[PDB]
Design a protein around this ligand. Sequence first.
Ligand SMILES: Nc1ncnc2c1ncn2[C@@H]1O[C@H](COP(=O)(O)OP(=O)(O)O)[C@@H](O)[C@H]1O
Lengths: 370, 49, 93
Amino acid sequence: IANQPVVIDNGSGVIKAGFAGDQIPKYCFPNYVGRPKHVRVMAGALEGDIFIGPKAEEHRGLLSIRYPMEHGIVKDWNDMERIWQYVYSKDQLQTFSEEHPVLLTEAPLNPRKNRERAAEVFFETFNVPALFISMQAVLSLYATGRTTGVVLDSGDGVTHAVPIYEGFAMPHSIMRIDIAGRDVSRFLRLYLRKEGYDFHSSSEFEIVKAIKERACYLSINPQKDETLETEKAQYYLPDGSTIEIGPSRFRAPELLFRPDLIGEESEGIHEVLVFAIQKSDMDLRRTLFSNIVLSGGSTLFKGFGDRLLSEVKKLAPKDVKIRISAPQERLYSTWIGGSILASLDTFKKMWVSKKEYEEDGARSIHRKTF
Amino acid sequence: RESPEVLLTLDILKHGKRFHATVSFDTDTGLKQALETVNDYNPLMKDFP
Amino acid sequence: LKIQVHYYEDGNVQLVSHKDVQDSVTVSNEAQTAKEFIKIIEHAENEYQTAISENYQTMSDTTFKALRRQLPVTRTKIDWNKILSYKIGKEMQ
Ligand SMILES: Nc1ncnc2c1ncn2[C@@H]1O[C@H](COP(=O)(O)OP(=O)(O)O)[C@@H](O)[C@H]1O
């Protein structure tokens, strides 16, 4: 026995949510809380001091933004409860919580303590009847409806590649990199001070993030493309100010393939990705050549998959046809896939009742992990 | 169960994307095996000398 | 050729193989043709003996895995309870 569950597609930057069997996440709001810088002695103005969404984005000025979650590992768990309480807002739910099944998201390569504390929240502070969350890549595959695939997510500062054969991942061939657009914008901030500009405020930095997402693409041959002169079509701020560009429009996003240039013993998404592919079956790579699942919204770049095709030619196999799946609802793919799963009578076997948590809890977490 | 207004609401609830809940509601009904038992032992129930 | 090896301590082993070939060359004398013919057969036998050793090498990797594989599709383990339930996603694609 249950109610209609809700799929909460936790984007590393923007969390999303929405009831079962639907097509579009009901809510789409980010992951940070602002608190006012200035206080007042005046009587009659606003209250709250904790805002997320249009309230925060509305009056960004005093609300000092702080991202509580880092690579899934959140440190403001209490504030996450407040965030989920905000998910239970009047404008948000007006529903109950201890009487409905739900669905959140889970990326791999994580400490169990996160799931442990999560169960503590939803089953100590809440009394959720049944709830089970699994690997996000399968949800993307649900959106595809394709047995095998190479899913690559793209969070704000989180990325990971997973190959799955008919609903079976490869634990010995799954990789992850701790970065996405987060340090890309931070690196753009670096470029800003490289040519003398600081955008040290939190909101200011998110504005920089929006600028990045607004004007950035991929180049063909980076060192050869460096030989030209960027004309820097200046954009003009909401404040009304000159915005130069530099190589940032193409150089800054390729930091992903130059972690040594940023200071990290890593190689590249496609590099370690194809390495894990090499660790897979001699035969399944053939399937994965056409089964290339693109996911995550950080992927929005001109010639993104095209430069990725160039990367494929860099890591060329022994002449075998390859194909990439590049949909348009890559962020929504996981939410919709969960909605598909949430629209299944198979969750009876795929769930864990709260009574099970009452009986064991931690042991149910360890044993009934997946 | 044969009341048309409740069945009407059931059809609209199905239409409201909650097909699983509505189907599960009627699968909860063991009226099928109940009535087959009714008529199974009914000649042993009724007309008993 | 002719091969017939057999082992039967708890397991049947019936090794039978051969190779039959023919060549031709013009007669010179006794010594030349002697070392010629025997050298040809000699190398062919040693050659095929080596081929048999490599055939054993082809057994371990091809033959076995051609019939009885060693690893799963994930090539690592088998969760029997996962087979007992969950319905892993047999209705996605
Ligand atoms: N124009 C754009 N170019 C590149 N990235 C973008 C653009 N617009 C939005 N994004 C990205 O969409 C991504 C959504 O990330 P997130 O919701 O954290 O993904 P995930 O669901 O993989 O965690 C963000 O990382 C943000 O940088």
